[PDB]
Design a protein around this nucleic acid. Structure first.
Lengths: 32, 139
DNA sequence: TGTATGCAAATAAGG
DNA sequence: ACCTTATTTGCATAC
């Protein structure tokens, strides 16, 4: 199987992605 | 007012409550079409519940969805152009026109519209979108 | 038979 | 007007 090249428009930053970044930051902040 | 914390929970809650009411994703959009002028698609509803929409796009849709669910839980029940479907034959001709002339003039757009029996603005938008696609695919 | 998604029409907002 | 860039959406279709 060969990777295709994504053709089209995507939501630049989804809420899903924003939430994941918070949890990553919160993990480091919670530790510090 | 909304926050990523509230949006995450509403998407979880909304899906749970809508299934119990017996509504499918598409039915929600159609009910939204009657309640609110713009008819929304199953695709948009799925993206809202999956948190795969933009922050502001979700913030905008949440109040409209909240009213429907509360109003429909209360009482038991159950300006945007439609996307034009371009058939493979029309698309192949347009791609051929894009090769010979990347940026058509309005007069050239009008002729192509008459040739393929399509409305002019759709052809104009198609070339505008096609040009952007070429930019992304070939940086 | 619903739900997720690739691809892309429609729209918004500057020149 | 219509070019641009940048998002909002929705057919069609694979799950």
């Amino acid at each position: 199987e060969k990777p295709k090249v994504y053709q089209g428009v995507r939501v630049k930053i989804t809420v899903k992605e924003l939430l994941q970044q918070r949890r990553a930051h919160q993990a480091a902040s919670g530790g510090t | 007012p909304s926050d990523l914390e509230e949006l995450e929970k509403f998407a979880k809650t909304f899906k749970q409550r809508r299934i119990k009411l017996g509504f499918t994703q598409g039915d929600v959009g159609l009910a939204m079409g009657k309640l609110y002028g713009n008819d929304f698609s199953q695709t948009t509803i799925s993206r809202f519940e999956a948190l795969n929409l933009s922050f502001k796009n979700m913030c905008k849709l949440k109040p409209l969805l909240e009213k429907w669910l509360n109003d429909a839980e209360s009482s038991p029940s159950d300006k945007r152009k439609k996307r034009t479907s371009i058939e493979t034959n029309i698309r192949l001709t347009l791609e051929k026109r894009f090769q010979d002339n990347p940026k058509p003039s309005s007069e050239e757009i009008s002729m192509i519209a008459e040739q393929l029996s399509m409305e002019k603005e759709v052809v104009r938008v198609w070339f505008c979108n096609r040009r952007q696609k070429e930019k992304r695919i070939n940086c």
